[model samples]
Target: PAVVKNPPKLALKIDRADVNQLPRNFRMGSDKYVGVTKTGIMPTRKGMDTMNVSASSCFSEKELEAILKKVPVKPSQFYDVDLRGESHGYLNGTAVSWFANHDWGNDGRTEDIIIPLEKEQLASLKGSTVKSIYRFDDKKNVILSPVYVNYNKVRTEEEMVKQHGANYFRLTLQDHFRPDDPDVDKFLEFYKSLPKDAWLHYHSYAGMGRTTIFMVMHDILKNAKDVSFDDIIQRQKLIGIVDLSEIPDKKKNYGRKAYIERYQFVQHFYDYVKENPDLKTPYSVWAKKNKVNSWEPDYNGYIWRLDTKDRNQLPRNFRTMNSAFRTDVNVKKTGKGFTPTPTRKGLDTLYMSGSAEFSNGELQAMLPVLKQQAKGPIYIMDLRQETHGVFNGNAVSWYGLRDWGNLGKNKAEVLKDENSRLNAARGKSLIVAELDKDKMPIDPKPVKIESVMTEQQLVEKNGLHYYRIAATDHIWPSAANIDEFINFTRTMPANAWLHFHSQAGAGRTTAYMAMYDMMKNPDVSLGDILSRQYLLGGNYVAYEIAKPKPDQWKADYYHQKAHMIEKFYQYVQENHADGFKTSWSQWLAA
Candidate 1:
């Protein structure tokens, strides 16, 4: 029983081709690939249609931006990948398999693009059975083994495995959600039965969603011992799996919640697999059966929850946000460059928006416009944590002038004694604010900023500042950190153009906005401060106090945040004397 150490990535032979023929819409440097896709076809045309016919055709940077505005996310997608691995695949014409993936966000399918193949149907097992084709070696070549798609009578999966015995097994998963707990248990049983060299392949309508999910599951099975759970998820991302953890902002209702659950499930599953080498129990009992806290069977209501451990805790802020404010408030409105304070109510010009993650092109175009829009120096209050990968190259530009990346470097400084990269500076200097006041001072490190910013430094650096602040997702900042944040607010230059962001531009962003509102206008009641920010279409600030149903695991966490906000209100009200006078850098130096 040899372990599959180097299993090849699964090739998505999207929809099956007829007999010996190929998909008509696949690109072969010809028109066959170019056809109507969804009503999402190439475009109702933006950039291609319009061109300013200037004499000499030369343009300045201003005109370049105007010209570039039309270019956007492409409507169609196709990948040309080789399907060669330890396990054999039913090849489609060439060794290179191609799939024109259906867009997960919308009905992004177009006419003639993977269309001459089969349209995905809800009904299945009507001769459209999953099979391993056999070798004919005649006019057509074939060799195979297969199963049926049975969404209704799921017993077909079990029976199919039994009918063909060893290799012809299939498990069905819902499009874009977490697998049922029982389903996970079923897989554990099935997987344990398989011989070590067994080749596992997964397919979904488009390979982006469910297929990616299973690949991660397979990833855990194969490599959980050698790799950390985080690494497994990250590696899957690097190889181009649409991350199950990341629910796009466009998702709403159950679709959004499902992605969250899916995200939590992946992590817990990783722990389960790593701990258990010789598998015996299904995850259903494995999760509930008390290993310790050790008493009777742990009857937990939260399906994702195994015990009182933190990993099982997932966000339920959506429901709280819905009860307090519109769930759709944060949805980006088209052409709204960024949301600024309505009519400049605050002392500084603050621009609020979601993460400029993967928005390289968008940010490149937007940043210059923002500089001009600001009519002052721009400083971004980046609230995201260090764990998020910076795939965007624009980070190089951002980190050059100021400390931006929150890549914690306390250990680097302590062990090595002096690790000074602009990116790593934040970790040493940052005052990590958590609402849990009683937790031991996270091994409090002395601020090793390498150097502090002065007025001359701001001017030398062209007035661009990136202050990497501490506000973790969906939790309240420490009262001390919030105090630091409030004091830091008074130090801003009179005409500072501030921008706020976290991953979603929701919880942390809105809460910070409310804090700023309180700092600038302490007389303004917390109710008005919250109402005003909510009106601007960010997340509701007082989510901590919403008193909506919460996941039991996060109940204490939520209580802390709610408590801190009130304390923050009192702190700001009493200490309004700093009054736009002190600078945080100098204050810290003292």
Candidate 2:
């Protein structure tokens, strides 16, 4: 057996009620998540106690804005604010007003830090907001140049602390669709190595998205318990500063897609780091090799495209194709009482039910309608393994045991006994025939007399061509087998009628039809696709199990059926335009 690789992803657990709890005495200053106090140090029951004011703790939002207005901060500059939790008197000034009564914290100590967002983010803010931060940093005497760590870019911790002469650390990122900067991992390590008493504060445009990610990372770093992605997102949302709420304009690039993509990227990155704690290689290197960690921004956000003009190439825009393929087909009703059932309609194709029990009279009665409906070559799909010569001419069949044990007959017995009525009924027992431009059978006689082992014989039967596909009853076609079936369909002449059936033409027939529909309409939602197949007389076991909501299908069984369709969809994309020439095994592995 061949090894399977890169299995499909399943659903993620999203918990709404789970949330993060804020710190005691936590106060939001001018800086969203950052806080300040009259005393430099927050009083603890332990004593006039010792929790170092984190980088995010010192200033209020208005105070930070005022400081930025005076002297705009840049990535290359180092800024530190005093946050001792204990207070001196008050400093009075427009930019320093928020800290006025702030108990200057630790006597005269000013080791606190004020972090600036990525240069691009700060540039996005109004001049006033920038000047406010600039003036605040200058008046507080916390601003210094000859930069330490620009958190948005890659930097080593040793170089940062040793060269910049810094103890406190601050990071700032943008609330964009992209993932965190490469240096985020390094910064996390640096933060983890800090003394328990060391203070750290980080900020973003809204102090939500980026701040939330950092906070979650920090929490997990300190206590690596059974944490999940849901736990991480929930904790960030509880912090109250992070913008966890949904944006109204889902179509806008900077709205919900941006937010959700950023969150998902962060979650994946966090998982990667947590799973490989000793990871020394840069995330970029590992991500590319593993086919993840990178994202393509589009209207649909995280989903990738499989629908395209060529079957050998992957599509770049899932959303574009999704919209392009969005359609509404009018389902016409046909057939009435005592009439043969109507053939199901697909995008540009149709499905007809067939059976081995049809008598000669029934076959004669149905041939005209079936022929009229075919409008092209009907490719016979014979699923019975034991029976031979049931129908004359080219017939597609598998060589296997009759597994329908309800009759209590073994494979040999089932093959030995013949339905004489059914035998006499054969106008064309198990064969697919195409109609001409005049709406007549392409082949005068649809079935051949000899029964060849379809598994070994490569012969194409005359009149009706029996392109033998070895598929078992009830079970879905295997990967390799399905590839063969698709290849056969691809070789048929244009506008040819394709037919498929097992004993009842419900199980194997429908499975093949579902696969066909998947290839033809790649952008349709999984649920709608399955529903259409069921409507077309396909006895889809998984669809039945998950009816009312195909998304609710059982994971294992749904994936089993969905995987086959996915493989074909991928094949079409990978082989776009020109036919796919790559070997099947290689494609499957990819």
Candidate 3:
């Protein structure tokens, strides 16, 4: 058994409230626009904040436009605003501002970031001459270039500092909580006394949360794929609804894009730090500048496809995606109102809740073997890319947002402290909701999660290495039909493959059944093809050459199942399209 590399990612699955709100201009022209996924969640003191909920969980293009009208300032606002306590601490300081700053807090629009000159503000100066204004520096001293600051030369020093704060604002505020300031001492003490557990209240929009953790896990495994600079440009052309004919790839740097879900729209993004990079703008700008697709991770944005070839890959624009998950109930203070159910197909909706008592049981069952095998801190096998079928619903990435370039000066340190210290483990077993079960939020109380066994016990009970095999996507494996799936499997008889789905969608389990049934039938038939009608209201199919049992499933779970599809496809022939009756065998049989 190959050693399981990479730490586990604690996927904090939370729901968004505002799903039906429309964009500003849509009212004047098209009334059909609605929602934004640049959604955010924050922990607020009772009575201090009013949580605004939306009827939908995602936003359409028109809705995204309306929501962007509410972003009063740029992404840099998080740095300048002290969002602790009264202002919704998480909203003010973290990346959540992109989602929270809109109608709920301020009146800004998506045009503010994209169509800069539409408002004729100082920030809009570059909207006309935009020739890729971002630069990054990869040196240790400078993670990337700071050249994207559109107003660097004209802005004063005081203005620059005033305009930006550090990364991890929530933690920064938590660190600065006054021992005498309101509930500061109590919150800190609460944090200190709480047991270790995963955060289920977290969403993808905030500066730090499950998304951040998944990136960390991806880095640990070193499983992420590499795309070339040309591929990046092609993907941008393929996915971005915007045109890039004017911007030539002069540097020719081999920028990479991970194909975790290469067929899907919500894919992983990272900047090319190969030669030299500069990061001058606020940290959030880096996330934006580094954005490969139009789906800005913030609220005040739109999901645009520069080229109009495959609109399906683009999905809803920025505002619509945000609106899809908007909810009035705050996820932090009250978990009762949220739903763990997935609103769309191809999503991984997670709901984990465990009392202080349940954690001990989990620790007894799962920890001993892990402890024996891992010498360093054992990471959780996370599944962040399990799509919730709306917004930027994903969890896997190799590179995290630039700590300094995106967040600000010292935010990373503070956020890291809170995450590892407050959550990892306290002197007891951490109780956590089971990932395979429970479709709702778990209790906030920490339960015990441990590794009771040593290396010897792992060998005695489990196999040499723990393996987690999961479905990557509804991919069309080689062999146009069942014969193809079987032929591909027969080519490589040694490996065993099992399939299952996350709580929300049918692609996982359904796809597994299709392939499993096909494998047993020596004679090929349409029935053996294993096409499971997507009961969740989408087209879905699954296939398998071998049986993947529950024990194997437990061992292989990781932060977003990637290598499962990645390794499975390695044996497939190139140029094979993925779809029903689309593999090599289908072509050959035809």
Scored by lDDT, the top model is 1
Candidate 1, position 438, lDDT: 41
How many clashes show up in model 2?
76
lDDT (tens digit, per residue) of candidate 2 on 1-590:
12123211211110011123322123221123233222343211221012222223233323333333333333223333221222111111111111221122122221121111111122233233212221223222222122111112222222223243433343323224343444455464665555554544443323344555555555444433355555444434443445333444644754667667766666656766776666576566566567765542221111111111112221121110112221332232211111122222354453333333222233344345445666566555554433333233222221222232213334344444323323433453333333334424344443433322221122132244454444545444656557776676577776665555454555566666666665555555444555555544444434323322434323333334544454555665566345546634467665
Instruction: Give the candidate order by descending TM-score.
Output: 1, 2, 3
Candidates' RMSD to native: 27.1, 23.1, 27.6
Pitting candidate 1 against candidate 2, the one with the higher lDDT is 1
What is the Cα-based TM-score of model 1?
Answer: 0.31
Better of 1 and 3 by lDDT: 1
What range of 10 consecutive residues in model 1 has the weakest lDDT sum? 301-310
Q: What is the Å distance of residue 85 in model 2 from its true position? A: 58
TM-score of each: 0.31, 0.30, 0.22
Q: Which stretches of candidate 3 lie over 4 Å from their true place?
A: 1-431, 434-444, 452-460, 463-506, 519-523, 527-590
Tens-place lDDT digits, model 3, residues 77-118? 222112222111111111111112111211121211212111
